[PDB]
Curated annotation (Swiss-Prot):
Function text: Chromatin reader protein that recognizes and binds acetylated histones and plays a key role in transmission of epigenetic memory across cell divisions and transcription regulation. Remains associated with acetylated chromatin throughout the entire cell cycle and provides epigenetic memory for postmitotic G1 gene transcription by preserving acetylated chromatin status and maintaining high-order chromatin structure. During interphase, plays a key role in regulating the transcription of signal-inducible genes by associating with the P-TEFb complex and recruiting it to promoters.
UniProt crosslink position (Glycyl lysine isopeptide (Lys-Gly) (interchain with G-Cter in SUMO2)): 57
Entry comment on modification after translation: Phosphorylation by CK2 disrupt the intramolecular binding between the bromo domain 2 and the NPS region and promotes binding between the NPS and the BID regions, leading to activate the protein and promote binding to acetylated histones. In absence of phosphorylation, BRD4 does not localize to p53/TP53 target gene promoters, phosphorylation promoting recruitment to p53/TP53 target promoters.
Residue numbers marked as site, Acetylated histone binding: 98
UniProt disease link: Cornelia de Lange syndrome 6: A form of Cornelia de Lange syndrome, a clinically heterogeneous developmental disorder associated with malformations affecting multiple systems. It is characterized by facial dysmorphisms, abnormal hands and feet, growth delay, cognitive retardation, hirsutism, gastroesophageal dysfunction and cardiac, ophthalmologic and genitourinary anomalies. CDLS6 inheritance is autosomal dominant.
Entry comment describing in which tissues the protein is expressed: Ubiquitously expressed.
Highest taxon above the source species: Eukaryota
Domain Bromo, chain residue ranges per copy: 16-122
Quaternary assembly: Interacts with p53/TP53; the interaction is direct. Interacts (via CTD region) with CDK9 and CCNT1, acting as an associated component of P-TEFb complex. Interacts with RELA (when acetylated at 'Lys-310'). Interacts (via NET domain) with NSD3, CHD4, BICRA and ATAD5. The interaction with BICRA bridges BRD4 to the GBAF complex. Interacts (via NET domain) with JMJD6 (via JmjC and N-terminal domains); the interaction is stronger in presence of ssRNA and recruits JMJD6 on distal enhancers. Interacts with NSD3. Interacts with NIPBL. (Microbial infection) Interacts with bovine papillomavirus type 1 regulatory protein E2. This interactions may serve for the tethering of viral genomes to host mitotic chromosomes allowing successful partitioning of the viral genome during cell division.
Residues of the full protein shown: 44 to 166 of 1362
Organism in which the protein naturally occurs: Homo sapiens (Human)
Protein name: Bromodomain-containing protein 4
């Protein structure tokens, strides 16, 4: 058993764009998603199939770019900060679980640099 994936639809929430949320989807997510190091982050960590028996012991808030993509596409987030918080969680999870020398960590770090390059140019 893996946790259910995070919720991605918010049925009773009305649709509202913001400049920031449009930027997060069309610029930030789009750039990260197509990067060559995206693939370990494109879907929830399957701790069963990946054989990480301690993964949910260590990680209390699973998060991934597949979930973030869908939340953005579904206008799940009320604001840009919620979305940014999910990216931060995703990277945090990687850095607190994996060993510092691991390729997955260096991949995360490459992605996070890009995320931050782009979040620095965020609109308001
Ligand atoms: C320990 C750990 C494993 C992974 C990880 N590896 C793979 S390998 C693999 C996947 C896949 C995946 O999700 N996630 C999913 C399907 N294919 C792309 C095979 C990701 C992170 C962030 C992590 O901290």
């Amino acid at each position: 058993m893996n946790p259910p994936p995070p919720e991605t639809s918010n049925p009773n929430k009305p649709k509202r764009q913001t400049n920031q949320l449009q930027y997060l989807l069309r610029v930030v997510l789009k750039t990260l998603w197509k990067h060559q190091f995206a693939w370990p982050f494109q879907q929830p960590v399957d701790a069963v199939k990946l054989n990480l028996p301690d993964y949910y012991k260590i990680i209390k808030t699973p998060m991934d770019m597949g979930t973030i993509k869908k939340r953005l596409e579904n206008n799940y987030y009320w604001n840009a900060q919620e979305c940014i918080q999910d990216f931060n969680t995703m990277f945090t999870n990687c850095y607190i679980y994996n060993k510092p020398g691991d390729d997955i960590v260096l991949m995360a770090e490459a992605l996070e640099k890009l995320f931050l390059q782009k979040i620095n140019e965020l609109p308001t």
